């Protein structure tokens, strides 16, 4: 109670001295002299900081000393402390000092804010920043209509201005929930006991309330409840726990011989009380009396089995909130004991009547208050989560009462509960389909016919309210022709010209909306003068004045004169120009308060509703920040510091939408222009001009990154207006060239860049340190552009631009050197590839064969020698520049694949080996880790010498292993232990590889003997465990004790060995001090099923946590390892791109550690169940629990196996018949696993994105064998994990009964996506992933070329593997596969080049085609 007392006493200090002395000495006794007490030390530490005043100086000093013990606080620790204090809040006004301190901490450190955002990337839902934002919003909500409303609102707006519109990667707002409450609820296993606990907790909380009338009712109810047998059982269960409610309720609990018994009274007709229509449907007002009367009627008349409910009448009579809380429990209790469904029918009829009355529009009964609607929605939501007496399924449990869920969904949408509205719409659609089967556009028109509500329109409205961008595409197609929908689509896609044309053309649209859209489109197109003249013409609604003020402050007119937002901003800027600082600060404070109040008045359902308010608050905060700079004398250091702060906080907004970043940049530009105008000092004016030029260049770059062209041109024009140029060399001219190039005006950009190059060459010989970077960048960009447009021959481009750029060229200089080296290497590689393609082409061989049938031969020999010399020169240049590029940076690290491919192919070339030995060894070792498998498989002992390939490769492998033993030791040892399986139980290339691996192992052991010995022992134990026969316990499923003779049990405390199946973060330094190490193995091991019966074991590490590992014998895991490497590279590519990073598109991966030719170990995914196990299980499959009257999976499999020998027509007919009697059921996974609508929506969206990404990535890699048992779904995250990666690169199409689908997109997979199916989120995510794949075709091609040519990678289909799957020619096969992959990446399908959307449309229609699905193998289970 200390915090409550302190918060109450703090305001009383200012009242008067007479009470000030008493309050001060009481507080001093509370905190000052009590610091010795250990019990209250934590309570004092977790307390609100005292207000900063002279009176509180000693208290503040003591509080700071106590809190900041054991070290200082970081930003994350400060926010955690703020939230922990916020756990208990008596009043919002007591949090003002904490809010100010939090704002100061946030504004002081933003690099720590970047670190926090990076750390929270893995689990965005548990992000600290979004939690802080929602906590602040809730605090501001609680401050409405109180004494300190404006003070709290201003502080909340001040702190929210610091964070700004950061992309939180969340869509659903998760309100804070008590952890102890959930655990206490979990403790009780009986329904009646939980009601008792909840009611007693509510009464205990009510006891503290001020009203004396409610206290008597609360104590009476407590005494009545605790006397009964249910109360005694509750106390017996709950006395073991630790909670102050136990101590508070001790006096009321009494011991009596007989438990208090409630006299059960039964009327002649219990249904007469609740049969009144007026009772259920209230008026517009009088909600409290309505809910009280309904609760009394339920309690007095309806017979309730539970004794606790009957004792709640005195508490229900006084408090309305108690009635609202208890009504669902009363309804559930009455429905539990219902017989003959009389109560069910009556309640269903009355509730449906209430919901229909809510949907009118006055009428006789309509326009009900939102409180009653929310109460009924809470009743429905509570009933949805309760298991029905007849058991059944969650879908069955939804219909406790016969309800038309479309009306309920519409009411929920009207109440701003969008996620539950979508869930109820889905439930209604499913119920309508189920009912129709007994006897969207069709469903929409039917629902409009009977219920008067269109399903498609409701779904569109709900998805618009949610704010998810991708979902809006798949809503429907009924109203696409309407101008309003087209205009909304144009605005969403930033097609401002189309939106402007449509707004001008359509006149049926209301004038206000039409003019607002016209003004917004004109502003977004950069037509500022046209917009101003148009507004002047309109002079012949508040929104019009709002747009007037926005245009006025954006155009700096300064003449166009409840206050709104842009009006406040314009007034603040005008007063800032007029040096009226008081009005400036007052207007900014008023704008803060108004924006925060408007934000907190909303229901706060989705995160996307917070971004505009955050952007506006950030703009206001920046204006207030520059206010003090304008107030005092302007210095260069202050301007540099404020620009650095702006750049950091813009870096915080990297992934934010352009619609939120743009107003901030516009305000910054106006700010800088005003500051330059009001300078009157040449020395500072130059610095202000430089700052404005840098800001405008950054704005141009930002607008170009979002495919915007008018804004960069306007920014360049402003730069020209201010930064008048006569020297003719500057970075903004390079930015102008880039802008012109972005507009597809290549001639102008090339002319500008060549003029800049000639001016730079004439001015100096690249001797100015400031202009060196600009010269190098101009040369490199011009060379790349000329190469792209083919306007110059390769010789001129190489000699004039790229080689010169390298020769011209301190972090910026290092980055420029890296970029120039990469460009030169890429051009040289292009020339080398062109010359090699010509040498390997059929035209060259035909020309050679023509002369095969005398000076012609001499000329041919001379030409061949010249071609070979040119090829070698290009190769050497490319390799050298790649090596130099890898040295000077880390951004282009994935080019190590191309470098290693070039080195490996030309092994015999001494120059390449020489430059790899001299400068290649200086490359950091961690950059070779992704290619460790190939580099280790390529090593041998044949070419031994000073510049021999094998010697250099062995040295590189040894250095990599020395620097990163944890990442490479297992691979090398597995190379050495290829044939140790037979030795443990009882070709020249292979033996050379074994010898090289043994040599590297000997070197590492000479460096680290103990680690090598322990790793060898662990590998031997794993191999011995794998070879153990497990057919004895094949039927066993409860776990089997490992035999004592197994060496694995003996191993203990291996502190030099890290858990092999645990992913390890790459460390540039070679310390690796703090890593989890293997401690012991649990005695029991389980079986996962399958032909070979793999064993699952548990490995407890240094900490208490343990990891499950899958030990596989008689199986090859190297293919899985390399496929996981490909998946990691694709994940890096996806995370690098902004569009795929925003959607969190990733490929789930699991670490695989091969041990021998046929032995290995891999990480076992926890919480993942196979989709086939969930769907078509014989015992408790989803197809059996739901739709039990349909065909069983056994019948479908039998029919499809029987129709195997018949023709294609018979197969198609049988497949259609099976699909008719086998409906999808997979949509219930998220419905039954996640009961909260927001969590359900998030998990379903994650599932859809995972399906899209996995499908696209698998198609790019030609992934096959994607049956039900090879796909797992995580129960916690609802994401799919693809396993058994043996078949890839379209080798499944060579099988008998070839696979004719790019990926698995069967009816269950699409059904899991929701009512929209493949439309909406899935299609757009597939398009984004395919676009990312297209943009990185060269990197993927290099990676796959390195992988395929790996000697140890067995990826070609063979007759033995073909027979097992369904119960040199290698060079040309690999070339054909690479060409097919290149065609896929470029988009060439069957000789026709397609766009990303067209290719995605083709893939989807090929995957979902029943014609292709019918011809597939019956084991693939296409019907599932
Ligand atoms: N990483 C993993 N996480 C979880 N379960 C896995 C994992 N890898 C394999 N399993 C399961 O282990 C069992 C057998 O795995 P597989 O590698 O597919 O064996 P198999 O040689 O393919 O024989 P099958 O599956 O009967 S054709 C299946 O039940 C898989 O779901
Ligand atoms: Mg399998
Ligand atoms: Zn009305």
UniProtKB/Swiss-Prot annotation:
Consequence of substituting residue 412 to T: In a colorectal adenocarcinoma sample; somatic mutation
PTM statement from Swiss-Prot or TrEMBL: Phosphorylated by NUAK1/ARK5. During the late stages of DNA damage response, dephosphorylated following deacetylation by SIRT7, leading to ATM deactivation. Acetylated in vitro by KAT5/TIP60. Deacetylated by SIRT7 during the late stages of DNA damage response, promoting ATM dephosphorylation and subsequent deactivation.
GO BP annotations listed: brain development; cellular response to gamma radiation; cellular response to nitrosative stress; cellular response to reactive oxygen species; cellular response to retinoic acid; cellular response to stress; cellular response to X-ray; cellular senescence
Outcome after substituting residue 605 to K: In T-prolymphocytic leukemia
GO cellular component annotations of the record: centrosome; chromosome; cytoplasm; cytosol; DNA repair complex; extrinsic component of synaptic vesicle membrane; intracellular membrane-bounded organelle; nucleolus
UniProt family annotation: Belongs to the PI3/PI4-kinase family. ATM subfamily.
Protein name listed in UniProt: Serine-protein kinase ATM
């Amino acid at each position: 109670h200390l915090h409550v007392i302190v918060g109450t006493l703090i305001p009383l200090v200012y009242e008067q001295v007479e009470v000030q002395k008493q309050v001060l000495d009481l507080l001093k006794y509370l905190v000052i002299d009590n610091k010795d007490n250990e019990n209250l030390y934590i309570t004092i530490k977790l307390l609100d900081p005292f207000p900063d005043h002279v009176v509180f100086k000693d208290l503040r000093i003591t509080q700071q000393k106590i809190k900041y013990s054991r070290g200082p606080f970081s930003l994350l620790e400060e926010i955690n402390h703020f939230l922990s204090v916020s756990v208990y809040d008596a009043l919002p006004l007591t949090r003002l000092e904490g809010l100010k301190d939090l704002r100061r901490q946030l504004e002081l450190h933003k690099d720590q804010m970047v670190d926090i955002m990076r750390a929270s990337q893995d689990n965005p839902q548990d992000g600290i920043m979004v939690k802080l934002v929602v906590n602040l919003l809730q605090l501001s909500k609680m401050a409405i209509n109180h004494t300190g409303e404006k003070e709290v609102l201003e502080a909340v707006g001040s702190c929210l201005g610091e964070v700004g519109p950061i992309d939180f990667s969340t869509i659903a707002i998760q309100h804070s929930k008590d952890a102890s409450y959930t655990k206490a609820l979990k403790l009780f296993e009986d329904k009646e006991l939980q009601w008792t606990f909840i009611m007693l907790t509510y009464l205990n909380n009510t006891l503290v309330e001020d009203c004396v009338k409610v206290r008597s009712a609360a104590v009476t109810c407590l005494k009545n409840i605790l006397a009964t047998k249910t109360g005694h059982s509750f106390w017996e269960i709950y006395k073991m726990t630790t909670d102050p409610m136990l101590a508070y309720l001790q006096p009321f609990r009494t011991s009596r011989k007989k438990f208090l018994e409630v006299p059960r009274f039964d009327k002649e007709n219990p249904f007469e009380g609740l049969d009144d229509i007026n009772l259920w449907i209230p008026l517009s007002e009088n909600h409290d009396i309505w809910i009280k009367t309904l609760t009394c009627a339920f309690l007095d008349s309806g017979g309730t089995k539970c004794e606790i409910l009957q004792l709640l009448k005195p508490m229900c009579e006084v408090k309305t909130d108690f009635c609202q809380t208890v009504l669902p429990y009363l309804i559930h209790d009455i429905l539990l004991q219902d017989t003959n469904e009389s109560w069910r029918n009556l309640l269903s009829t009355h509730v449906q009547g209430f919901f229909t009355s809510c949907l009118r529009h006055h009428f006789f009964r309509c326009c009900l208050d939102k409180k009653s609607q929310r109460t009924m929605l809470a009743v429905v939501d509570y009933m949805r989560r309760q298991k029905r007496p007849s058991s059944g399924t969650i879908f069955n449990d939804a219909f406790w009462l016969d309800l038309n869920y479309l009306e309920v969904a519409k009411v929920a949408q009207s109440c701003a509960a969008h996620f539950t509205a979508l869930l109820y719409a889905e439930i209604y659609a499913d119920k309508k389909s189920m009912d129709d089967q007994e006897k969207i556009s069709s469903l929409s028109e039917k629902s409009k016919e009977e219920t008067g509500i269109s399903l498609q329109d409701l779904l569109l409205e709900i998805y618009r309210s949610i704010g998810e961008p991708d979902s809006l595409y798949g809503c429907g197609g009924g109203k696409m022709l309407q101008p309003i929908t087209r205009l909304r689509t144009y605005e969403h896609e930033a097609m401002w010209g189309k939106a402007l044309v449509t707004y001008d053309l359509e006149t049926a649209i209301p004038s206000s909306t039409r003019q607002a859209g016209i003004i917004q489109a004109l502003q977004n197109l950069g037509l500022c003068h046209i917009l101003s003249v148009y507004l002047k013409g309109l002079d012949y609604c508040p929104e019009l004045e709002e747009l007037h003020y926005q245009a006025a402050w954006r155009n700096m007119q300064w003449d166009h004169c409840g206050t709104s937002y842009h009006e406040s901003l314009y007034n603040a800027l005008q007063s800032l120009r007029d040096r009226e600082f008081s009005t400036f600060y007052e207007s900014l404070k008023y704008a803060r308060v108004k924006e925060v109040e408007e934000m907190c008045k909303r229901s706060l359902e989705s995160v996307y509703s917070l971004y505009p308010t955050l952007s506006r608050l950030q703009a206001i905060g920046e204006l207030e920040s520059i206010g003090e700079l304008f107030s005092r004398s302007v210095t260069h250091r202050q301007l540099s510091e404020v620009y650095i702060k702006w750049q950091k906080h813009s870096q915080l907004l990297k992934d934010s939408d352009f619609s939120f970043q743009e107003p901030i940049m516009a305000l910054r530009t106006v700010i800088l222009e005003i500051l330059m105008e009001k300078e009157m000092d040449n020395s500072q004016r130059e610095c202000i001009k430089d700052i404005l030029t840098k800001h405008l260049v950054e704005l141009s770059i930002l607008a170009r990154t979002f495919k915007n062209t008018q804004l960069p041109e306007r920014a360049i024009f402003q730069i020209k207006q201010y930064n008048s140029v006569s020297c003719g060399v500057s970075e903004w001219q390079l930015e102008e060239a880039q802008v012109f190039w972005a507009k597809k005006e290549q001639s102008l950009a090339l002319s500008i860049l060549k003029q800049m190059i000639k001016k730079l060459d004439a001015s100096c010989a690249a001797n100015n340190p400031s202009l060196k970077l600009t010269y190098t960048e101009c040369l490199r960009v011009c060379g790349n552009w000329l190469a792209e447009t083919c306007l110059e021959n390769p010789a001129v481009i190489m000699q004039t631009y790229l080689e010169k750029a390298v020769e011209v060229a301190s972090d910026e200089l290092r980055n420029g050197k890296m970029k120039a080296f990469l460009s030169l290497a890429r051009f040289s590689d292009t020339q080398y590839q062109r010359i090699e393609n010509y040498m390997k082409s059929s035209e060259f061989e035909n020309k050679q064969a023509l002369l095969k049938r005398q000076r012609e031969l001499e000329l041919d020999e001379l030409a061949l020698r010249a071609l070979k010399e040119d090829r070698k020169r290009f190769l050497c240049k490319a390799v050298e520049n790649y090596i130099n590029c890898l040295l000077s940076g880390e951004e282009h690290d994935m080019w190590v694949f191309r470098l290693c491919s070039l080195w490996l192919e030309n092994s015999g070339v001494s120059e390449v080996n020489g430059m790899m030995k001299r400068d290649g060894m200086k490359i950091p070792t961690y950059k070779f880790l992704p290619l460790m498998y190939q580099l280790a498989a390529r090593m041998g002992t044949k070419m031994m010498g000073g510049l021999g390939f094998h010697e250099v490769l062995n040295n590189l492998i040894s250095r990599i292993s020395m620097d990163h033993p944890h990442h490479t030791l297992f691979i090398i040892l597995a190379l050495a232990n290829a044939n140790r399986d037979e030795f443990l139980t009882k070709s020249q290339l292979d033996e050379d590889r074994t010898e090289a691996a043994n040599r590297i192992i000997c070197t590492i052991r000479s460096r680290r003997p103990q680690m090598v010995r322990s790793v060898e022992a662990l590998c031997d134990a794993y191999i011995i465990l794998a070879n153990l026969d497990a057919t004895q316990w094949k039927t066993q499923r409860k776990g089997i004790n490992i035999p004592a003779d197994q060496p694995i049990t003996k191993l203990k405390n291996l502190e030099d060995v890290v858990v092999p199946t645990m992913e390890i973060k790459v460390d540039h330094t070679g310390e690796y001090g703090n890593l989890v190490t293997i401690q012991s193995f649990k005695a029991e091991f389980r079986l996962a099923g399958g032909v070979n019966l793999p064993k699952i074991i548990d490995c407890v590490g240094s900490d208490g946590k343990e990891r499950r590992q899958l030990v596989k014998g008689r199986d090859d895991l190297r293919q899985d390892a390399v496929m996981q490497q490909v998946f990691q590279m694709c994940n890096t590519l996806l995370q690098r791109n902004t569009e795929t990073r925003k959607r969190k598109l990733t490929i789930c991966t699991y670490k695989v550690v091969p041990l021998s030719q046929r032995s290995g170990v891999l990480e076992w995914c926890t919480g993942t169940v196979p989709i086939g196990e969930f769907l078509v299980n014989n015992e408790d499959g989803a197809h059996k629990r739901y739709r039990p009257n349909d065909f069983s999976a056994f019948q479908c499999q039998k029919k499809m196996m029987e129709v195997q020998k018949k023709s294609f027509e018979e197969k198609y007919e049988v497949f259609m018949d099976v699909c008719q009697n086998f409906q999808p059921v997979f949509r219930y996974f998220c419905m039954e696993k996640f009961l909260d609508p927001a969590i359900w929506f998030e998990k379903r969206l994650a599932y859809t994105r995972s399906v899209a990404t996995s499908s696209i990535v698998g198609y790019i890699l030609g992934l096959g064998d994607r049956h039900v048992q090879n796909i797992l779904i995580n129960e916690q995250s609802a994401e799919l994990v693809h396993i058994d990666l043996g078949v890839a690169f379209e080798q499944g199409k060579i099988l008998p009964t070839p696979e004719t689908v790019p990926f698995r997109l069967t009816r269950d997979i699409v059904d899991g996506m929701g009512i929209t199916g493949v439309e909406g989120v899935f299609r757009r995510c597939c398009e984004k992933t395919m676009e990312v794949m297209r943009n990185s075709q060269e990197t993927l091609l290099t990676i796959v070329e390195v992988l395929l040519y790996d000697p140890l990678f067995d990826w070609t289909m063979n007759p033995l593997k073909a027979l097992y799957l369904q119960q040199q020619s290698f060079n040309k096969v690999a070339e054909r596969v690479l060409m097919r992959l290149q065609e896929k990446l470029k988009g060439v399908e069957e000789g026709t080049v397609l766009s990303v959307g067209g290719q995605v449309n083709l893939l989807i229609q090929q995957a979902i085609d029943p014609k292709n699905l019918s011809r597939l193998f019956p084991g693939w289970k296409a019907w599932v």
